[PDB]
Design a binder for these strands. Structure first.
Length: 308
RNA sequence: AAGAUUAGCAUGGCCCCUGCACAAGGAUGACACUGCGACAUU
């Protein structure tokens, strides 16, 4: 029960949505609480921070009266609603002709919490248009048997954020069915104690000298022009929006051929940034990680092999 | 008496080269969803 821990979780939700917002128009963002508890403080803090629109789920009657009492003494009914769900029906509620849910948050009990995440994984396969799913774990030992289940369904857009507040080490496992990819501070922690269950990398760094710090923009423009990768110059940021891989030997051997194979297919949106002689490659959108691993190792080889 | 970290080696994919495809191999520098633990501390 830590107010800075719950606020840090809502701040992870904000950092997860914000780094994965894109260039789209600012719609009203809709959240979905799962098991809001007897306090119901999670959607309250979300609306106090950035004016989200929560339609929370509930399995209790006394806590539903408590949630309505918190609604009555907080008065945000165009933001906060609480809905009693059923036990056999999908706990992820319908759209009902409303505007689509955007992010889903879950405070499971502490079948177990692994089986609860299994039920949410089973129900979440049917919900399209909903972008973000999260689930927070207290025990470290729940990390394997959930992620291994998530290692059964080829879900690559997940992440484990290490909530570190003294003796409180929580692990946020966030998975999504849409291609948006958050930062690397958000999904892969520093401690290697769960290096068996890290998600994939979304950020790569390289360090240079002021010679190559002067030459870094010419190197990046020559790289993104000599490879037919679509790019744009937004300030000092070089943004990249490809819909298939146009940077590998396999891609050339196919391009330099005659068969009717279309392309090696996987969508990527990413950014190149120059911070203090450093080049950062930073992954924004894409279902398949192999596209971004290929691009980051091609960029590493491009920064190395222009030194001679 | 009970185990992690840590320095080298197999394995896995990624960039480069050979290769019609699948393979296989080479070379190379960053990785880890795999292990192998010659020291030293806890």
């Amino acid at each position: 029960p830590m107010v800075p821990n719950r606020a840090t979780y809502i701040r992870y939700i904000h950092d997860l949505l914000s780094s994965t917002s894109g260039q789209k128009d600012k719609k009203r963002i809709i959240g979905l609480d799962i098991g809001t508890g007897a306090s119901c403080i999670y959607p309250l803090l979300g609306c106090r921070m950035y004016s989200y629109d929560f339609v929370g789920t509930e399995i209790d009657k006394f806590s539903f009266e408590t949630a309505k009492s918190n609604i009555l003494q907080n008065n945000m009914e165009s933001q906060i609603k609480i809905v009693l769900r059923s036990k056999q029906d999908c706990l992820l509620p319908d759209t009902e002709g409303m505007e689509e849910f955007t992010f889903v948050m879950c405070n499971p009990p502490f079948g177990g919490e692994v089986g609860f995440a299994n039920k949410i994984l089973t129900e979440s396969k049917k919900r399209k248009g909903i972008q973000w799913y999260t689930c927070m774990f207290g025990k470290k030992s729940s990390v394997p048997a959930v992620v291994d289940k998530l290692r059964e369904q080829n879900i690559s857009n997940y992440g484990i954020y290490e909530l570190a507040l003294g003796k409180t080490k929580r692990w946020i496992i966030c998975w999504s069915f849409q291609a948006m990819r958050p930062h690397n501070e958000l999904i892969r922690p520093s401690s290697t104690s769960l290096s068996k269950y890290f998600p994939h990398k979304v950020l790569q760094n390289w360090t240079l000298d002021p010679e190559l710090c002067a030459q870094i923009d010419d190197i990046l423009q020559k790289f993104l022009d000599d490879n037919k990768i679509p790019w744009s110059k937004k300030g000092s940021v070089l943004e990249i929006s490809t819909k298939s891989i146009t940077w590998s030997r396999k891609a050339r051997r196919i391009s330099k051929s005659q068969t009717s194979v279309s392309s090696l297919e996987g969508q990527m949106k990413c950014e190149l940034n120059v911070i203090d002689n450093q080049l950062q490659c930073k992954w924004i959108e894409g279902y398949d990680y192999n596209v971004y691993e290929s691009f980051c190792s091609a960029l590493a080889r491009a920064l190395r092999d222009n030194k001679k």
